[PDB]
Subunit: 236 residues, 4 copies
């Protein structure tokens, strides 16, 4: 890429957020934590009204479907996942629509899957779709196709690579990257950097400066864009 | 198949409706005709509460997106389709959710495309999804993937074939199938039968008794299921 | 008023529709008939896009709440209306919002009750609200306050009187007004005119030309505005 | 009442929250802050799933309408509040419905105004409505009638009085009640206690133990119910 130090990260013109499946779902995998989700939608809409062109990759659509049913799964578990995923995708897109249009923005559910990034025709089609959507002041929300799926991070890295984004914020649960497992002497967190780690290395080789923050920390995106020593930063 | 005469069509246990792109969109391709759409949703929900297991194939999602934007396309046509398709898919699934839950039913947007019916892994996945959704008392709504698309009828025929449905109602604009173009002497409509025609022949060879009704006719599905001489009927 | 013959009714600049409680609720009082409701919303939105300034008075909000619960009333009828009315008002306003914004219009739920038309302060406030809403290209939907209520037709007449509307369409179930009960010789329907009848006489004395159509008849509003001999017409 | 010390507040069986007009609207009066609103909805739904019977009094409905229009007010401010209030009430009830049903709860918009608490017939009707709604496992949301209105706190006090609630949480912006204006020596915050102050004294005389917390403090309700020295507590 071109970015080297965290001080430069105020000049990134195309973010790609990626809400991890452990940030937005409450501590059961049986709900949808509204606190962190509303905070992250607030930060993303505010950052998009600032002039950048964000593009979320929302994970965790099975949880909304599980909680929306909560009855037909119960009455069937005594007489007897993808169905929950489908129903949840629909309902979650509705809820995102509400909580985003509460800031003036519009959204547009784009559904892809990892095989769609391998053939050239589908890659061309998807890039054309995303560019026509970005040029219209819309925030695409790129979920994974649930009905053709056997933690959507490699997908986010590859998507940032194709669209060639400046940043790639990768929210998660762990505070960052340590030097050794936490149950050890010398758990020195490595802010800079000489699964998530592999995808970050990939996106680094493809011209993308990955950053791995902590989801539960208040005002995460607005902080990491500014330059505070938060999260993790991958660059030679 | 097994069905021969229209009198037998009261014993079909798995319908596959298919709302044509000229039935639900008002006469501009710039809106969404609520009259026919509400009538067809009413008939389908009533038929599903009767014991059958319907599965719509709703076309015309670009119209809802076009009308929902109506401003950002305007202001851009002076300074300068898939984007409209995406936004419309989201909004239309929301509207279907409302107008179906007004009858007690639940729906679940399933998004496929014609290449998903060629590989074996995706076909297995999709069939498992649809069976897990049918066994849960849900009405799947199978739109075509807009973001990986370069009048969704061949798709409906192939989908009915894979799930192996008894009937396949194929709503449209024309009253049926004539003997010659209308501007000719002897336009004898052929109810029985010794694009739509080709797909119907295909689905006939694959064990599906296709039927082509007229959309604007009031109470179409409830009539054709009963046995009245409406629409068209394909069987040797 | 000023209108005398049905030919003049093309120059009315302020309609007040009133959907009767027997037109939109399906034939159980336990649902919400989507066919007639969608047709009437289509006609009203089309008439409003024509330059007039309509203002619906939607009845039947208890039905939507009854059907939306359908479970918590059931499980309680073995261990043991206004609650259904409240929940239904909310859900029905949401559904109207969807099916109206599908034509570009916006709506704004205004909740009044008959005692609000007797004191002068509340009458002034309500008139100011309605005029500020009409001058903004919005279609107010004037339901009756359910939580302060012990077939909302007198309300519609009085509302048309205060706002001083040219027309007052009063949709209902009966085709019109007969000369005698139907089980009699000589059931001559009286189109012109030298409960509903009393409210119509009132609104006639207050400068409003009431018209009573049949709800189930297709394209009712567009017909009666044109001048066809449909419904009933009250004028000396 | 019966409660004296904050240690006893774990045994209150009927809360009445009241979200102040400065907690949920972002710092413009031109939006709807999703962070605090989602946090408060999360806390209230969690407290209601605990066995209590909460009943919100959501303020700030004009902000949602202002932001939802944002265009028709703009284009009219060059050619030229209650309208915004009406549109906002509708949209905000929809958003609350979504963010509450994401926890399993159902809600039911109840619209009252201060004159509805003075006549006996309307008071009886409203109490019957609220009791029939509480006995159904529903969370009523008691906004003030905007179309018959010339910071809804006296309303909340009187409502808690009529329903005779154990607690009355009154969220706001100020951390509590000080001994003197902040620009003075000796700004000793008074947790216990020997506008908001007047309403609290009233509700104390009517058998209600008022509590005034700080909205922006994370996990406010769950804390104050527990017994931590937060907010303010009114009791002799
Ligand atoms: N269902 C997908 C995730 C879809 C989503 O992004 O919500 C999975 O389990 O991998
Ligand atoms: N956009 C697709 C149709 C999608 C739909 O079914 O709505 C097409 O034009 O073929
Ligand atoms: N609940 C009211 C009618 C309210 C409405 O207009 O829906 C009644 O029964 O009179
Ligand atoms: N519009 C009312 C408040 C209504 C509400 O609770 O949102 C007022 O300004 O007093």
């Amino acid at each position: 890429p071109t970015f080297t130090e965290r001080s430069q990260l105020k000049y990134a013109r195309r973010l790609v957020v990626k809400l991890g499946s452990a940030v937005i779902t409450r501590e059961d995998n049986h709900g949808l934590a509204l606190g962190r989700l509303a905070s992250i939608v607030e930060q993303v809409a505010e950052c998009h009204l600032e002039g950048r062109e964000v593009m979320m990759v929302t994970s965790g659509a099975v949880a909304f479907g599980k909680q929306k049913l909560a009855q037909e799964l119960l009455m069937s578990l005594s007489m007897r996942p993808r169905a929950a995923a489908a129903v949840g995708q629909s309902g979650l897109m509705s809820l995102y629509d509400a909580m985003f249009a509460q800031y003036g923005v519009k959204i547009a559910q784009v559904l892809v899957t990892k095989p769609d990034f391998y053939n050239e025709e589908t890659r061309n089609n998807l890039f054309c779709t995303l560019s026509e959507l970005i040029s219209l002041n819309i925030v695409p929300i790129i979920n994974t196709n649930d009905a053709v799926s056997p933690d959507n991070d490699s997908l986010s890295a590859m998507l940032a690579a194709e669209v060639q984004a400046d940043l790639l914020i990768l929210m998660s649960d762990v505070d960052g990257i340590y030097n050794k497992p936490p149950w050890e002497d010398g758990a020195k967190l490595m802010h800079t950097y000489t699964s998530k780690v592999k995808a970050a290395t990939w996106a680094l080789d493809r011209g993308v400066s990955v950053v791995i923050c902590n989801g539960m920390q208040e005002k995460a995106i607005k902080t990491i864009i500014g330059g505070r020593k938060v999260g993790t930063f991958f660059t030679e």
